[PDB]
Design a protein around this ligand. Structure first.
Ligand SMILES: *C(=O)CCCCCCCCCCCCCCCCC
Ligand SMILES: CCCCCCCCCCCCCCCCO
Ligand SMILES: [Fe+2]
Ligand SMILES: [Fe+2]
Lengths: 341, 218
């Protein structure tokens, strides 16, 4: 049994998705109610691999909302994640993806040292962040978008916004060693983490966001932003490819214009219909086929029988792990989401 | 953290609530023993194990130099007492079980869990003893109603509607009180909903049912 632990992107989305399912009690209430709400299994999932193997899974709603962080409800947010993980273990789920901000909260607030949740002791090998698969998928999306637009990736500039993060640092390593990208712009908040990533990569310029934007042919957005920034088209090159891998989306608005291509980063599409409701709630273009890559990782781990915390922690993702999850990804029938033309 | 000044004021009513709570539990379980003959022995066991908790919390009010306001605590439980006595008088055992082994137990589970990490060392040690018993009392109500689920469902839904809103009123009454002891209302609601939703799932309710039932009155 695999598990998917996620959360909604806003209170308005949470109230809308609740009302659209039968959950009217959650649709009528505000932040304080969500702050005390328990985790809930709200979807049963069956997936068939291209190899024919059938797996089963469950979606767990954590009831975390990004506004909790802006309202500084840091302890609330911590409980949402720990209660959701405890819920997965109590129900005997073998491997669960910590989607979206639940993995970020887990790391930023050192939740490893809080692993006793009521009568439960969390077993970290039953969880993955899914970040290895997300980093792999985003790299394939860069590669394919470049071929699709007639851009030579070895002659082009890629800016990685969030380059010090777990996903961002993996993408940088693969863009360097497997794609031979022309040049790499590293962008992030922590100077020391940037300095260290530049050393370990042996290349890349460090630039603030406002100076990275106008220089980039591709911008990979993998920043841990609760909110989403507003980018004016006029500041960007033409053509520019925005790969927005954030959840919530790093692009707080629709960036549309001449020579601007926006791609939902870290999304895969399956060769078979999947019977479930949660990707409709997530506004995938094809909600019966498409899903976030971190959730696909949990499916891959269950397909392969790799019941372990395959993606864990921060900055531990290696090229060989990305290659391994990527081969499993193709084999079981997943393909990276491509530019929509 | 002080264990000084207002903490004793607040602790007077809280300790009172827990004594009376454990008292109401002793009685409710005795009357259930009459109401269910074929488990009269088993119920009498849980009932006695409750008096032991009451002694334990008497002790907690002792070595912290607190005198518990037994009047306040009796007003605190009046409605649920009133609802219990009337249901038992009418022979409605399904409703009695929900009040005592589901609602009141999960109230205690939530309260004590939240209390332990902010308790002084002595009360914390004792509190940690009781909390695991309460989970076992919960499981008695759980397993009975689970055996008689089809026959009991409608009355459970009715008793949830009649009594769960009292929990919310009670948590509001005692809120800022409980804050002085270092315990947040938000965490109390969550722990209650977690433990109550759990018992309901074991009993047979589905997720949308539990979500409707657990939030009723909130
Ligand atoms: C992975 O890489 C990022 C994953 C992001 C998290 C995706 C969560 C999708 C939302 C699922 C839909 C929620 C529906 C249940 C709402 C229930 C409310 C009571
Ligand atoms: C202990 C402080 C918690 C604050 C919440 C109010 C006091 C506790 C609620 C009442 C608990 C009653 C439990 C009685 C025994 C149930 O088996
Ligand atoms: Fe008790
Ligand atoms: Fe009890």
């Amino acid at each position: 049994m695999f598990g998917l632990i996620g959360h909604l992107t806003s209170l308005e989305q949470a109230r809308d998705v609740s009302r659209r399912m039968g959950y009217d009690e959650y649709a009528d209430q505000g932040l304080e109610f969500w702050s005390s709400a328990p985790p809930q299994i709200v979807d049963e999932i069956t997936v068939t691999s291209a190899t024919g193997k059938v797996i089963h899974g469950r979606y767990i709603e954590s009831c975390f909302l990004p506004e909790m962080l802006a309202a500084r409800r840091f302890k609330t947010a911590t409980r949402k994640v720990l209660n959701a993980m405890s819920h997965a273990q109590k129900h005997g789920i073998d491997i669960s993806a910590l989607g979206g901000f639940t993995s970020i909260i887990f790391e930023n607030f050192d939740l490893a040292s809080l692993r006793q949740v009521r009568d439960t002791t969390l077993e970290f090998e039953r969880f993955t962040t899914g970040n290895t698969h997300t980093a792999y998928v985003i790299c394939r999306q860069v590669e394919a978008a470049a071929k699709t637009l007639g851009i030579d990736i070895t002659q082009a500039t890629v800016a990685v916004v969030g380059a010090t993060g777990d996903i961002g640092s993996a993408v940088c390593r693969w863009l360097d060693l497997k794609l031979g990208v022309g040049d790499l712009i590293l962008t992030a908040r922590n100077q020391e983490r940037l300095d260290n990533l530049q050393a370990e990569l042996g290349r890349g310029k460090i630039l603030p966001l406002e100076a990275a934007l106008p220089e980039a042919d591709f911008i990979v957005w993998v920043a841990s932003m609760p909110q989403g920034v507003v980018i004016d088209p006029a500041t960007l090159k033409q053509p520019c490819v925005l790969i927005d891998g954030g959840y919530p989306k790093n692009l707080g608005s629709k960036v549309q214009g001449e020579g601007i291509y926006v791609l939902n980063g870290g999304v895969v599409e399956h060769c078979f219909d999947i019977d479930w409701q949660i990707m409709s709630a997530a506004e995938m273009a094809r909600p019966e086929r498409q899903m976030f890559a971190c959730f696909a990782e949990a499916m891959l781990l269950e397909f392969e029988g790799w019941h372990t915390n395959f993606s864990w922690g921060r900055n531990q993702i290696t090229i060989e792990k990305m290659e391994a999850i990527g081969e499993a990804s193709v084999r079981h029938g997943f393909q990276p989401l491509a530019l929509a033309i | 953290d002080f264990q000084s000044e207002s903490y004793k004021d607040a602790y007077s009513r809280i300790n009172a609530i827990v004594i009376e709570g454990e008292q109401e539990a002793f009685d409710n379980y005795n009357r259930l023993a009459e109401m269910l003959p074929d488990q009269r022995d088993e119920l009498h066991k849980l009932a006695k194990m409750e008096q032991r908790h009451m002694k334990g919390f008497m002790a907690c009010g002792k070595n912290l130099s607190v005198t518990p306001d037994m009047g306040f605590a009796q007003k605190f439980f009046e409605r649920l007492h009133e609802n219990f006595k009337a249901a038992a008088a009418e022979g409605k055992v399904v409703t009695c079980l929900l009040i005592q082994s589901l609602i009141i137990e999960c109230f205690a589970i939530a309260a004590y869990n939240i209390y332990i990490p902010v308790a002084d060392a002595f009360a914390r040690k004792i509190t940690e003893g009781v909390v695991r018993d309460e989970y076992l009392h919960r499981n008695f109500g759980e397993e009975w109603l689970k055996a008689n689920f089809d026959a009991s469902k409608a009355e459970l839904e009715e008793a949830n509607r009649q009594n769960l809103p009292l929990v919310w009123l009670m948590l509001n009454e005692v809120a800022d009180d409980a804050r002085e002891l270092g315990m947040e209302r938000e965490s109390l609601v969550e722990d209650f909903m977690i433990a109550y939703g759990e018992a309901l799932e074991n009993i047979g309710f589905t997720t949308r049912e539990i979500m409707r039932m657990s939030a009723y009155g909130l």
